[PDB]
Design a protein around this ligand. Structure first.
Ligand code: HEM
Ligand code: NH3
Ligand code: XE
Length: 184
């Protein structure tokens, strides 16, 4: 179960965040820590496509090779806070699992600049019990977390030392599929 009402960044710049480009997860923190593996690869694209607010997601477990993509349509709750319904797709956007009620995530941008961001999600997926997930993002898949985003982690009353890095997993990403999936 989730327990946090994450606070959106004051002055969040939606057009900059949702610019159609790719964000990589470099570090994450799951408050129900055994809900997710200790080794993982994740990235997203975020943008407006034909007037609709979208995300394209990519998950990869580098040990099991479990892979999945999703396309999300986001509804606005308040600036920097969204509710997203998702459909699982192949990398070309063909639907594998349709949008369903009960399958959604909240998405809150707690901090962002041009290069880095801190987000919170609460995933809901059928009768699974999932928790609060925080993720440090960067535009550069190899960027170490800088002071701006680490300070934001502190300002959320979290400890960056507890976040798990994705950097030693040899993660490789298909940016082209993420960008094209925004349209799907
Ligand atoms: C960048 C923010 C993230 C978002 C918005 C997000 C969103 C989602 C969504 C929508 C699903 C369901 C996909 C489907 O069934 O079609 C999912 C599943 C999952 N995510 Fe994430 N995710 C994020 C980051 C992460 C990270 C960093 C991890 C670290 C391990 C992770 C681990 C998982 C796992 C293990 C599942 C499978 C859940 C299950 O079926 O039991 N996710 N995520
Ligand atoms: N997730
Ligand atoms: Xe993701």
């Amino acid at each position: 179960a989730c327990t946090k009402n994450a606070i959106a960044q004051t002055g969040f710049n939606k057009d900059k965040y949702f610019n159609g480009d790719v964000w990589y997860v470099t570090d994450y923190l799951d408050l129900e820590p055994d809900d997710v593996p200790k080794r993982y690869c994740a990235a997203l694209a975020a943008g407006t496509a034909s007037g609709k607010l979208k995300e394209a997601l990519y998950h990869y477990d580098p040990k099991t090779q479990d892979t999945f993509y999703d396309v999300s349509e986001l509804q606005v709750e308040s600036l920097g806070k969204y509710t997203a319904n998702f459909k699982k797709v192949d990398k070309n956007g063909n639907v594998k699992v349709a949008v369903t009620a009960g399958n959604y995530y909240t998405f809150t941008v707690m901090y962002a600049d041009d290069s880095s961001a801190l987000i919170h999600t609460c995933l809901h997926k059928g009768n699974k019990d999932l928790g609060d997930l925080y993720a440090v993002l960067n535009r550069n898949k190899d960027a170490a977390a800088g002071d701006k985003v680490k300070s934001a982690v502190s300002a959320a009353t979290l400890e960056f030392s507890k976040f798990i890095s994705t950097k030693e997993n040899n993660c490789a990403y298909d940016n082209d599929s993420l960008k094209s999936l925004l349209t799907k």
